[PDB]
Amino acid sequence: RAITVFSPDGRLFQVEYAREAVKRGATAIGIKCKEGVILIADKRVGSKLLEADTIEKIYKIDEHICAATSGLVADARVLIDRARIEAQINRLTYDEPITVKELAKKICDFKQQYTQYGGVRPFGVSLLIAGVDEVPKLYETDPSGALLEYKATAIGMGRNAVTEFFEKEYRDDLSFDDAMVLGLVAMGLSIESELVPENIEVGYVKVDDRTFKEVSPEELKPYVERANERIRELLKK
Amino acid sequence: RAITVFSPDGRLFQVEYAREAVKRGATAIGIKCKEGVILIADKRVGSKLLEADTIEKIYKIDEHICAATSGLVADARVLIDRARIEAQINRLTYDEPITVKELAKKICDFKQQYTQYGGVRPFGVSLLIAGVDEVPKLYETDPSGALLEYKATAIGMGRNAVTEFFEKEYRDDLSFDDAMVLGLVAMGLSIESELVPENIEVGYVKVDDRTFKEVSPEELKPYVERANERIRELLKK
Amino acid sequence: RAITVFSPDGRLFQVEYAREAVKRGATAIGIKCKEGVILIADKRVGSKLLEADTIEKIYKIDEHICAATSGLVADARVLIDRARIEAQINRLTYDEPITVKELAKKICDFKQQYTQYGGVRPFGVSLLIAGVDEVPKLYETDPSGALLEYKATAIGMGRNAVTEFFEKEYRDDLSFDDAMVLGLVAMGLSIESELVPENIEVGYVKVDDRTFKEVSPEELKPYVERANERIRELLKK
Amino acid sequence: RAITVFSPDGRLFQVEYAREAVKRGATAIGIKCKEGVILIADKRVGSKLLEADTIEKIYKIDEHICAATSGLVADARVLIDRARIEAQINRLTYDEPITVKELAKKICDFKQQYTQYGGVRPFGVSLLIAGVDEVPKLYETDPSGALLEYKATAIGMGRNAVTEFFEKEYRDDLSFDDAMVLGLVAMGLSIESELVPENIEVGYVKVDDRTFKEVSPEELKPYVERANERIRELLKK
Amino acid sequence: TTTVGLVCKDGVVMATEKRATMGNFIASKAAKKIYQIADRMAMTTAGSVGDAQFLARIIKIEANLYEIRRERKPTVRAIATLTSNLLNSYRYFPYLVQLLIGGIDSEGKSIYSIDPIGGAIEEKDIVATGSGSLTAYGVLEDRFTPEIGVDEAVELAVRAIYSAMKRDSASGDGIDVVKITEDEFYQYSPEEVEQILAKFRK
Amino acid sequence: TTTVGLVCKDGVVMATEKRATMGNFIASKAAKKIYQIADRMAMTTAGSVGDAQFLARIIKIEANLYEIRRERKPTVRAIATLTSNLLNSYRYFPYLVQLLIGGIDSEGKSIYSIDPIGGAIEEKDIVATGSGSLTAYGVLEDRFTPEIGVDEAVELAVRAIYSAMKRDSASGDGIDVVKITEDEFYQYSPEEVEQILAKFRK
Ligand SMILES: CCCC[C@@H](C=O)NC(=O)[C@H](CC(C)C)NC(=O)[C@H](CC(C)C)NC(C)=O
Ligand SMILES: CCCC[C@@H](C=O)NC(=O)[C@H](CC(C)C)NC(=O)[C@H](CC(C)C)NC(C)=O
């Protein structure tokens, strides 16, 4: 009899329902290694009529921070812009870039309010925030405003698949290219097949020059190729 | 027909449902002795993919105050930040650190409002606030805004276990190390097994140098070890 | 179809439900004699883990006014602080202490509003306000905002017990010590047994030096003792 | 689906339910004669523990105005204070006492709003406003904000009894003492017995020195006595 | 106006005279300029009568409420910080007042001199305030020693304010003194003061 | 008032004297004009006592909260930017204060001089502030060298503030000095300073 309230189980149905929306979302993956953090997203489209070359799934928050999103697409938009504003405000007041951790807490606090203030609904979206403070970092957010730091993970429908996979293959010492390839593979198993460089997006931030760059389609060819390798092989069972 | 209202029993269901959320929360323990107060929390994770070395469960409020939380994780965040602001405000206006007792009353008053103001819901969280005024102190809060001072206690799912245990083992004259070990034990019984130093957090504030310090993983080894002792032993029945 | 509204009976269910909350409340007693007014409360705890020496049940409002509370514990807090502010305000504007009667009317008016303003719920608490204007005075408040001046009474679960008792034993000419003992007795019958000085609180305000003082545990010994006397004796039937 | 709305009958249930609350109210009477107007109220208490000598049921609004109340006691409080403020405001703006008629209209307009503004409920109280402008006057108010000028009347549970009685005995030429006695009698029949001076209150305002005075318990003796007379006699059938 | 304050080895002393003026018009021969904030805390007020009186009320009320609510007495530092902030907030239309807040607390003994803009100096020994302060400072800085005890410190105080009354037409009419020892918060009464300055010349 | 700050090869040094005045009236011989913001950050305040004191509290509280919340210590740049913005926001009724905020942080060693309007100059070596700054600048610009070490830099600082006390009646009464090395944030105490200026003339 209100909006977002407690159930006898002590849970928030609105938040849980919001989570159902993120599950239906396109899958996004993030991997962290020593040399940096990669974020790769499913860019696949369902019609030759959509401008695929345009569609962007990995967003630049600041120079050293990017993010991937999943859930209600419209809500996600306001959320990343929100994160962008948040980043610039930090510069405006301290003349310094915001840490990936701080930025995450801030949008998470934002989302949390839409969780307990009657005349509003929660954000049907989950976020993958990656960047490099003094070390590479990866965080994933929940519709409730909960924050979690992962070494590697995913959000979206293909979640579980890549989660189980990384659970076995991921390693603290992976190289940048190894780490990335491991990611393209996870994606592959996720969509249940070999990947097409033309419909996947990859962004990263290397610990050397803390600046978000996005892997070009050409630089992708080799990685997708080397990944499709182990994918076909892995798609035996 | 509103939000948080009275039932014919004279109770607030929303508040009670909020309490159901805290019960599901990860367990946290607090023990007070003459030499100070310890706060230990279950840091255990459910995936090798989460950055365990990062996850923080015991928060510093001020130099002489820390707190543990249980319940909705996102609500908890705003609540400890709220407590942090509250502490600094005291400094800003009186040029003096806030007492643990006062700080507690303040966040409890804060939480109490979300209990009778229609367009909002209660905080699905309970807090353990420990610090040292002129003597060590330990308070635990409730979603309703109720405050209680304990000699020793716990919040979260493992609550009852450690409550019954302390009910028998706790003693007003425990030494700092004794008091702490008694806590690691309570935790052990709680999770139904021996503890792994690598997945439990401990923070404290000794009456000597009233400053919150957090037990390092190395300084933990001996304590966990000496605790796992009496744990195995105690896990006979 | 709103919040606090009239029933066909001409009553306010929310207010009555709030009253159900106060009945479940810890019992508190107030006795007025010529030499002053005493307020005694059940300080009894349900765990050796709670700092009993701390727990406070009788509050100082001003120098010449104290109050006991019953019902929702969190609500009570805001209500006494409210009373405290109210008292200082009187000083601020007239440079004079507020009378017990006036202070009572003010918090009662405060409580009355949460009784007819839709976006809010009533205070699930009842108050015993005691002090000494030119003569000792005792008032008890209701969740509805109703005010009543008693010679002696009680609120909380043990209400009826002690009410029936005072209804027979109380006398307009009781001495201060007699009046107090008569009160510890009422408490005794209330909790159905002899009292333990260590778990009851007593405060008062003597007409001589209009200042709220609280009976020390040592000064209690004799009174509790002399009361447990007539208690055991009275607990025959 | 709101709060105070129209029923298919064209009536306001909330207002009618509020009226049910006034019926349950303690009875109050008012009688007007040429020499002035009297207001008498049932002061009877249900416990020897209540300060009867204190309890006030007839309130002074201004020098030439008093009022009696019936219904929710807390609501009544705010309503008379409201009337009091209203009276002074008149003085503040015109440097003149407000007429009884004007004062009544004003609180009636006040009450009327809580009758059609969604986020609030009606006042569960009725009022008897008596004073002397250039001639004695008596008005009675309704939870709806309706105003009525009576020669003689009553509000509360004993209403009908005294209404039927005055309907026969009241006379336009009654003397002050006659009029008053007629009132004590109505009260007697109301409570179904002889009256006790010690538990009835009487206030009035004589046309000679337009100032509200309250009949002292001693000045009452004779009247109550002379009334109990015709009461016993009248309590034959 | 002239008020002094000295921190002795065994407590705190504060004193003021009783004159209130408006130009050369002597409006009062018995104005109150010394207030009790807490059990072991006092405050002297120099400046605008209305402003000082107003602030005095606020200060007391907040000191009380602080204790009643936290069951701890507020430290002079806490009251001084509180007052500084209030004063500074109104820095563009300040309360024309010079305040002296001091006494004994868990942190020790101390006195604070606070100006209209909330500028507070921590007086570790001697301090004067008001139109006569400069003359008062004369004797204070002449006869003061950190080992001075509250008992001779009240004499010194009377001594200084007495000199000041001699060269400040805005000061005079009498003098209040207050001793803050610990075992007590004492206020001397006319008789006792009149007898202390009797060992001088009047 | 006079305060200096110098960035050495091995750290930072900041010093001030202890005088507080109101016209020619020496209100204080021991005013505090040096505050600690973070572990390796200090701040000196010149200007309105009440304004500086007020701002100092805000600065501290915000530095604290910053760290407690982000579990990182704030850089001097951050505090300097923070303070600039605050100062400038009040540009039409500015806080009459000259601030010096510096120390050591992840970015290196630095000092910022900030004015009432929030105009911040990044001091890469030498800086003086207050009514005596111009005299202090005399010796500072005479004996300073980028290779100077914090240990001789504190001597230099005392040296400069000592000269200033000789020509600025608003300065004087003593001098606080603070060394910010990395292994430490040291405050010399009267004894040590008294012995450092002893190699001069007083
Ligand atoms: C009563 C405590 C205040 C101290 C006392 C001593 O000097 N102060 C005063 O007497 C101050 C002095 C002026 C210069 C601000 N006088 C005043 O504030 C008076 C107040 C009148 C009500 C008599 N004059 C004016 C013009 O406001
Ligand atoms: C306590 C350290 C403050 C810095 C020190 C250095 O200049 N400032 C001061 O001493 C300043 C100087 C003036 C010119 C603004 N003095 C002041 O701000 C004095 C302060 C009173 C408490 C005595 N007030 C006035 C109106 O002058």
Return the ligand number nearest the Cα of F97.
Answer: 2
Calculate the dihedral angle through the C-alpha atoms of F60, F65, F67, F70, rounding to the nearest 10 degrees: -150
Burial label for E191, CB within 10 Å (0-12, 13-18, 19+), is exposed
Stretch (H or E) spanning A88: helix A73-94
Supply B160's token pair.
């009852």
**Angle in degrees, CA A50, A52, A54, rounded to 5:** 105
Q: Which residues have any ligand 2 atom within 6 Å of their CB?
A: E 115, 119, 121; F 1, 20-22, 27, 31, 33, 45-49, 52, 130-131
Cα–Cα distance between D180 and D174 in angstroms, integer?
9
Helix (H) or strand (E) holding C16, with range, is helix C13-23
How would DSSP label each residue in E96-133? -EEEEEEEEETTEEEEEEE-TT--EEEESSEEEESTTH
* CB of A96 closer than 8 Å to CB of B94: no
Chain E, 132 to 171: residues with Cβ < 8 Å from chain F are 134
Ligand 2: which of F48, F133, F161 to mutate, most ligand atoms within 8 Å of CB? F48
User: CA geometry: angle at A176 spanning A175 and A182, to 5°?
Assistant: 85
- Determine, for residues C6 and D21 on separate chains, whether the beta-carbon distance falls below 8 Å: yes
Q: Count other Cβ atoms within 10 Å, centred on residue D135.
A: 11
Look at residue B71 and give its three-state secondary structure. strand
Nearest 5°: CA angle at D172, between D170 and D176?
80
F144, F125 in Cβ contact below 8 A? yes
Token digits for F96?
């009459």
- B88 and F69 within 8 Å at the Cβ level: the answer is no
Measured in angstroms, the CA of B116 and the nearest CA of chain F are apart by 29
- Closest to A66 measured CA to CA, from A185, A227, A166, A215: A215
H-assigned helices in F16-112: 49-70, 76-89
Please give the Cα distance from F50 to A236 (Å, whole number).
77
Phi/psi at C11 (5° precision): -115, 165
Distance CA C237, CA B200 (A): 56
Q: Where are the alpha helices (DSSP H) in chain D?
A: 13-23, 73-94, 100-113, 159-169, 176-191, 217-234
Cα A212 to Cα A43, A105, A206, D56, E178, distances in angstroms: 19, 20, 8, 78, 70
Structure tokens at F180: 């910010």
Q: What is the DSSP letter of A27?
A: P
Pocket-testing residue among E16, E22, E115, ligand 1, by greatest number of atoms within 8 A of Cβ: E22
The answer to whether E77 faces chain B, any CB pair under 8 Å, is yes
Tokens 């120098």 identify what position?
C63
- Pick from A213, A219, A214, A216: nearest CA to A63: A213
Q: How many CB atoms lie within 10 A of CB A210?
A: 18
CB spacing of A118 vs B119 below 8 angstroms: yes
Count the Cβ atoms, other than its own, within 10 Å of residue B117.
Answer: 15
List the alpha helices (DSSP H) in D114-197. Answer: 159-169, 176-191
Residue of F nearest to E113 (CA): F27
Most B CBs within 10 A among F53, F59, F68, hence the mutation to make, goes to F68
Residues of A in contact with B20 (CB under 8 A): 6, 8-10
Which residue out of F14, F43, F49, F161 has the highest number of ligand 2 atoms within 8 Å of its CB and is therefore the one to mutate? F49
D206 SS3 class:
strand
Report yes or no: B84 at the F interface, CB cutoff 8 Å: yes
Chains D and E touch (3+ CB pairs under 8 A): no
- Decide if F99 contacts F130 (C-beta within 8 A): no
Closest residue on chain A to B55 (Cα): A149
Query: F94 with F133: CB under 8 angstroms?
Result: no
Rounded Cα gap, residues F6 and F16, in angstroms: 12
Question: Quick check: E60 contacting C, CB < 8 Å?
Answer: yes
Three-class SS of residue B42? strand
Q: At what angle do helices B176-191 and B159-169 cross, to 10 degrees?
A: 140
Beta bridge partners of C148: C140
Concatenated DSSP letters of chain E: --EEEEEETTEEEEEEE--EEETTEEEESS---EEEEETTEEEEEEE-HHHHHHHHHHHHHHHHHHHHHHSSPPPHHHHHHHHHHHHHHTTTS---EEEEEEEEETTEEEEEEE-TT--EEEESSEEEESTTHHHHHHHHHHH--TT--HHHHHHHHHHHHHHHHHH-TTS-S-EEEEEE-SS-EEE-HHHHHHHHGGGTT-
Mutate to test the interface with F, among A88, A96, A105, A210 (most CBs of F within 10 A): A96
In this complex, do A6 and B17 lie within 8 Å of one another by their Cβ atoms? yes
Is the CB of residue E116 below 6 angstroms from any atom belonging to ligand 1? no
Q: What is the DSSP string of A96-156?
A: SPPPHHHHHHHHHHHHHHTTT-SSS----EEEEEEEESSSEEEEEE-TT--EEEBSEEEES
DSSP state of F190: H
Q: How far is CA F198 from CA B1, F15, F27, F159, F162, in A?
A: 81, 17, 26, 10, 11
Kindly list the structural domains of chain E, giving each domain's residue range(s) and its CATH number in brackets, ordered by start. 1-202 (3.60.20.10)
Catalytic residues of F: 1
**Distance set, CA F105 to CA C8, E8, F70, F109, F183 (Å):** 72, 43, 16, 6, 12
**Ligand 1 centroid from CA E49, angstroms:** 5
Q: How far is CA F162 from CA F130, F146, F155, in A?
A: 14, 22, 10
Asked whether E185 and E193 are in contact (CB, 8 A), the reply is no
Contact A58/A39 with Cβ under 8 angstroms?
Answer: yes
Query: Closest by alpha carbon to F2, among F125, F126, F172, F116?
Result: F172
Does A94 contact F78 at a Cβ distance shorter than 8 Å?
Answer: yes
Residue closest via CA to ligand 1's atom 19 equals E22
- Report the distance separating Cα C67 and Cα A34, nearest Å: 63
Q: Is the CB of E22 under 6 A from ligand 1?
A: yes
Cα angle: C199, vertex C202, C207; to 5 degrees: 175
> Number of C-alpha atoms within 13 angstroms, CB side, residue C142?
18
CA E46, CA E99: separation in Å to the nearest integer? 6
| Nearest residue of F to residue E129, measured between CA atoms | F27
> Would you give the end-to-end CA distance of chain F in angstroms?
19
How many interchain CB pairs under 8 A, A with B? 97
Q: How many CA atoms lie within 13 A of D81 on its CB side?
A: 10
Alpha carbon distance B133, F79 (integer Å):
30
Whether E129 is catalytic: no
Determine phi and psi for D80, rounding to 5 degrees: -75, -35
Within A171-216, residue ranges assigned H as helices are: 176-191
Burial class (CB in 10 A: 0-12, 13-18, 19+), F159: buried
**3-class DSSP state for residue C130?**
strand
State CA D137 to chain mean position distance.
12
Q: How far apart are CA B40 and CA A154, in angstroms?
A: 31
Classify residue D16 by burial, with Cβ atoms within 10 Å: 0-12, 13-18, 19+.
middle
Residues A31 and A170 sit within 8 Å (Cβ to Cβ): yes
Separation between Cα atoms, residue A136 and residue D176, nearest integer Å: 95
Cα distance between residue F175 and residue F18, in whole Å: 6
Report d(CA C208, CA E132) in Å as an integer.
43
Q: Judging by beta carbons within 10 Å of its beta carbon (0-12, 13-18, 19+), is residue A184 exposed, middle or buried?
A: buried
Strands D28-33 and D152-155 come out as antiparallel
Maximum C-alpha span of chain A: 56
**Are the C-beta atoms of C38 and C204 separated by less than 8 Å?**
yes
Tokens coding E73 = 């007495």
C-beta of E131 in contact with ligand 1 (< 6 A): yes
* CA distance linking residue A29 with residue E37, whole number of Å: 64
Q: How many Cα atoms occupy the beta-carbon half-sphere of C7 within 13 Å?
A: 8
Question: What are the φ/ψ torsions at residue A172 (nearest 5 degrees)?
Answer: -55, -20
Q: Which fold has domain B1-237?
A: Glutamine Phosphoribosylpyrophosphate, subunit 1, domain 1 (3.60.20)
- Rounded-to-integer distance, Cα C97 and Cα C103, Å: 10
CA distance F146 to F7: 8
Burial class of residue D63 in the structure, from the number of CB atoms within 10 Å of its CB (0-12 exposed, 13-18 middle, 19+ buried): middle
Give me the residue label for tokens 């005493």. C38
Distance E26 CA to ligand 1 centre (A): 10
Tokens of A207: 């610990």
The edge-to-edge listing of strands for the beta sheet with E97-105 is E34-38, E41-47, E97-105, E108-114, E120-123
Residue A101, chain F, CB below 8 Å: the answer is yes
Angstrom distance (rounded) from CA D109 to CA A204 = 69
Closest by alpha carbon to A187, among A222, A163, A204, A207?
A163
Resolution (angstroms) equals: 2.8
Q: Rounded distance, CA C37 to CA C150, Å?
A: 11
Which residue, among A94, A143, A98, has the nearest Cα to A123 in the 3D structure?
A143
Which two tokens mark F46?
């010149």
Crossing angle of helices A100-113 and B73-94, in 10° steps, is 100
Element (DSSP H or E) covering residue B153: strand B152-155
D64: amino acid identity, one letter:
H
**How far apart are the CA of C71 and the nearest CA of chain D, in angstroms?**
19
Q: Which residues, at least 6 apart from E97, have a Cβ–Cβ distance to it below 8 Å? A: E45, E46, E47, E48, E51, E52, E55, E87, E116
Q: How many CB atoms lie within 10 A of CB E152?
A: 15
Q: Is residue E81 less than 8 Å (CB to CB) from chain B?
A: yes
DSSP state letter for B50: B
Task: From residue A167, give the alpha-carbon distance in Å to each of A150, A152, A185, A202.
Answer: 12, 9, 13, 21
Sign of CA dihedral D151, D157, D161, D164: positive
F58 touches chain B (CB under 8 A): yes
Tokens of C52: 């009993």
Residue type, A123: F
Q: Which of E70, E80, E82 shows the shortest C-beta gap to B99? A: E70
CA distance B26 to E49: 60
A8-39 burial by CB neighbour count: b if 16+ within 10 A, else e? Answer: eebbbebbeebbebbeebbbbbbbbbebbbbb
> Which of F81, F89, F110, F122 to mutate against chain A (most A CBs within 10 Å)?
F81
Length of chain A: 237
- Closest CA of chain D from C148, distance in Å: 8
In sequence order, what are the beta bridge partners of D139? D129, D149
A201 residue type, one letter: E
Domain ranges for chain A, please list them. Answer: 1-237
* B7 in contact with A, Cβ within 8 Å: no
> Which ligand sits nearest to residue E49's alpha carbon?
1
Please provide residue C214's backbone torsions phi and psi, each rounded to the nearest 5 degrees: -120, 125
Ligand nearest to the CA of F27: 2
- Other Cβ atoms closer than 10 A to E112: 22
Please give the single-letter amino acid code of residue B211: T
Is C86 within 8 Å of C104 (Cβ atoms)? no
